[PDB]
Structures are given as C-alpha cells and as structure tokens.
Amino acid sequence: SHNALKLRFPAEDEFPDLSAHNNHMAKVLTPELYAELRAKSTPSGFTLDDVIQTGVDNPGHPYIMTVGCVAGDEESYEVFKDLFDPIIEDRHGGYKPSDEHKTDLNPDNLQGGDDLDPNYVLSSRVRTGRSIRGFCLPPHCSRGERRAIEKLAVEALSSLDGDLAGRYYALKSMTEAEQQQLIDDHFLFDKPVSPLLLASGMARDWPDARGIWHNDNKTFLVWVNEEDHLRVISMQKGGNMKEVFTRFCTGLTQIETLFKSKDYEFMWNPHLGYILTCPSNLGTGLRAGVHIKLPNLGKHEKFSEVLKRLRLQKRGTGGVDTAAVGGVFDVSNADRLGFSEVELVQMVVDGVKLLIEMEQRLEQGQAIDDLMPAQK
C-alpha cells in the first residue's frame, strides 16, 4: 500500500543518493537493480526499501566498508537474492550463489585444541547466532513475534540442567545489582548505540521481550532478541578450546531438540547455512576466539599480516590484563561462511599455537621469519 504509493513515482525519483556512500549495498545497488526490485515484497511485507534503509542512512567508510542492508525475514534472502548474492560474495571473499555451506557441530572432529598454552591464553570462547523459522527477523518482527520468541527461548533454556542449569534475566525488570554483575561478567547488552543497528528498526520497543540467560557456572550465555533471535556464547578461562566448543555444540543441540519438540526449528538451508539478520553473519555466524598475551608479537611489525595469513582477526583490549602484560589481544577466526564450525575453530586452534611459538621465540630474542606462515 505504502509501497504502491512509491511505485507511482519514477524509479529514479525514489532511488537513494549513494554518491558519497561506501558500503556493500551501495556498491551493488544500480539504478537498474532498484527499478527491478522495488516493487517486490516478502510474505511479511518486507520490501527492498526496508532491506536497504540502514545502508542509505549510514554511508560507511572507504577503509571499513559496512554491509548496508539487512534481511527482515527468512524470505528476504530469496526474494532479494539479486541484491544479497553480490553482497554476500563480496563480503565473504568469493562465496558464489551456487556454493554450498557445510555445517559441522561435532566436537570430535576438532583435532587437539584442548591444551592452548595457559601461560598465554587467558580465556577461550565460541559464539554464534540463531533464528527461529516462522518469525520475522529483529528489524521487522512485531512485539507479538518477539514475545513469542522470548517465551519459546525461556521454556527451553529453563529445561536445561546440570552443567547448563541457569536463570533468565529480563532487561525490563533488571535491577541495578543484576545489571552491575552482568557488566562485570561481560554478559550485559544494552540498547544499541550503533546507527547501523538503529536505522534498521531492530531497536523498536526496547527493552520489551529482551533478556539475558546464563548457566550458574557462567560458561554458557544466551542473549534473547538482541541483534538476532538468539545469540549463543560458550566461554571460560584458560585455553581449553575443545571444552568450550563441546559445551557450545551440546548447548545448541539441546536447545534445538527442545524447539523441535514444539515443532520449531532454526532457519537454515544448504546455501547460506544458518540464517541471520546481517549478511556478514551467515553460514556459521561463528566467532571463536581467545584473549591472549602477546606482548612481543603484538609490537612486531608483521603482527597484523601474520593474523591475516592465518585467516584470523585481532582487537586490542582495554582491561587491567593488557595493562599489566603490555599486550593482550582478542584474536578470532575471520571467516563465517563456506567453512564449517569445526574448520573455523580448527583454524583458531592452529593459528594460536603458531602465535605462541612466535611469542616464545621473541622472548628469547630470536627471529620468527622461519616460522612465518603462508596465506591460508
């Protein structure tokens, strides 16, 4: 109806001015593609203008190119595939429209990874996101859908016991004390301040139906209705990535089984893996990483390059840890789609091991050139 009104205007009159923009959406949205897709709509009523709104509002930057678009439901990726495919291929370094994504949530396929030198790895974690099929994604979901998702999530999470026994914390009723504890634990999320997220409409009705759940041992954490229906995180001190990944896989499996009993399932397909709001999170939507002490390597000229070759990413940290050590970094896999969860965790395990060997060499004041890896 509203779209019907826009259709009365020539396509070029509604076409966004992206002359100063720098995001994936802007790169692919040609005057032709816009005229071609602007009349389309998903069953929930999500249109091309809805998909690209955030990319129009947020120009992005030359160096850091943002995605500039979001899916509003599972059908968005199909209906507007001519937009998403090029963006997906570009963002995930060559992932073709015909490629297949393999999912592997079997910890036993992981080789080693249970002994990352604790003298360097302070903590390990693996996180992902999931969408419940049948409901619209955060940018487009109604208060009703969101509340239904929250109910489904809470039921399941409250059924978990033993190692995964825990409790739910609704943001709405959260006390100052709970809020602080969660903040000290790095388990809290607030209303997004990022315009990329705000412009998509995902922050509507905040904090209605949003919540945080974590097990009593504080090694398993779930965020409900934030960027995606569910955000799942497994973590713990030390470098036992295998243990962290095992809890990750077990937790996801149990939750899924709980959903299936009520006839619900995660959004997933052979091409895009698990479906999520932002194209950059498709496939495994998995980020496996470690907080690692690398005071020597961190100050080395080829640090960023080595990470790149190992297909890893880094971020500095701002805690007392890096202050005392003089170089603690948050390192994780860079890939998301076209690699299974196992292969992704494997690259972090393998990558970290080499990082540690280099750090030790540097400690001894030796060279690390012979240890340099080739781009993987």
Ligand X SMILES: CN(CC(=O)O)C(=N)N
Question: Per the annotation, where are the binding residues?
Answer: 67, 123-127, 186, 227, 231, 280, 287, 315-320, 330
Q: Which of 18, 37, 56, 67: binder of ligand X (CB under 6 A)?
A: 67
Residue 280 interacts, among ligand ADP, ligand X, a copy of itself, none and using kind-specific CB cut-offs from 5 to 8 Å, with: ligand X
Nearer residue to a copy of itself within complex by CB, 56 or 171: 171
User: ∠ at Cα 219 (213, 220), nearest 5°?
Assistant: 40
User: Per CB under 8 A, does 191 bind a copy of itself?
Assistant: no
User: Per CB under 8 A, does 258 bind a copy of itself?
Assistant: yes
Mark the segment that binds a copy of itself (CB under 8 A) among 28-36, 227-235, 268-276, 314-322.
314-322
- Both tokens of 352, joined, read 């970290």
**Binding string, residues 280-319; x marks residues near ligand X by CB under 6 A:** x---------------------------------------
Residue at token pair 């190692």:
163
Nearer residue to ligand X within complex by CB, 47 or 66: 66
Q: Which of 41, 106, 317, 360: binder of a copy of itself (CB under 8 A)?
A: 317
Q: Which of 203, 235, 337, 362: binder of ligand ADP (CB under 6 A)?
A: 235
Distance CA 198, CA 21 (A): 18
Distance CA 304, CA 293 (A): 15
Residue 33 interacts, among ligand ADP, ligand X, a copy of itself, none and using kind-specific CB cut-offs from 5 to 8 Å, with: none
Q: Which of 315, 324, 326, 366: binder of ligand ADP (CB under 6 A)?
A: 315
User: Per CB under 8 A, does 119 bind a copy of itself?
Assistant: no
Nearer residue to ligand X within complex by CB, 4 or 193: 193
Q: What are the start-end ranges of the E strands in 148-190?
A: 166-170
Residue-wise DSSP of 86-145: HHHHHHTTS--TT--------GGGS-S-S---TTTEEEEEEEEEE-BTTS--TTT--HHH
Within 8 A by CB and 6+ apart from 109, the residues are 342
User: Per CB under 8 A, does 262 bind a copy of itself?
Assistant: yes
Within positions 56 to 115, which residues make up the interface with a copy of itself, using CB under 8 A? 61-64
Nearest to 337 by CA among 276, 247, 289: 276
Burial per residue of 193-222, b for 16 or more beta-carbon CB atoms within 10 angstroms, e otherwise: eeebbbbbbbbeeebebbbbbbbeeebbbb
- Both tokens of 137, joined, read 């994604």
- Both tokens of 246, joined, read 């095992």
Mark the segment that binds ligand ADP (CB under 6 A) among 101-109, 173-181, 255-263, 315-323.
315-323
| CB-based burial label for 290 (10 Å; 0-12, 13-18, 19+) | buried
- Both tokens of 94, joined, read 């060559």
Residue at token pair 């896989």:
249
Nearer residue to ligand X within complex by CB, 199 or 294: 199
Gyration radius of the chain over CA positions: 22
User: Per CB under 6 A, does 52 bind ligand X?
Assistant: no
Nearer residue to ligand X within complex by CB, 73 or 350: 73
Mark the segment that binds a copy of itself (CB under 8 A) among 109-117, 278-286, 320-328, 348-356.
320-328
Enumerate the β-bridge partners of residue 262: none
Q: Which of 183, 269, 316, 376: binder of a copy of itself (CB under 8 A)?
A: 316
Q: What are the start-end ranges of the E strands in 191-298?
A: 211-215, 220-224, 230-237, 268-269, 273-274, 287-293
Residue at token pair 């907080």:
291
Bind-site residues for ATP: 123-127, 186, 231, 287, 315-320, 330
Q: C-alpha 286: how far from its chain's center?
A: 6
Residue 172 interacts, among ligand X, a copy of itself, ligand ADP, none and using kind-specific CB cut-offs from 5 to 8 Å, with: a copy of itself
Judged by the rule CB under 8 A, the positions of this chain that interact with a copy of itself are 61-64, 144, 147-148, 150-152, 154-155, 158-159, 165, 167-170, 172-173, 194, 208-209, 257-258, 260-263, 295, 299, 301, 304, 315-319, 322-323, 326-327
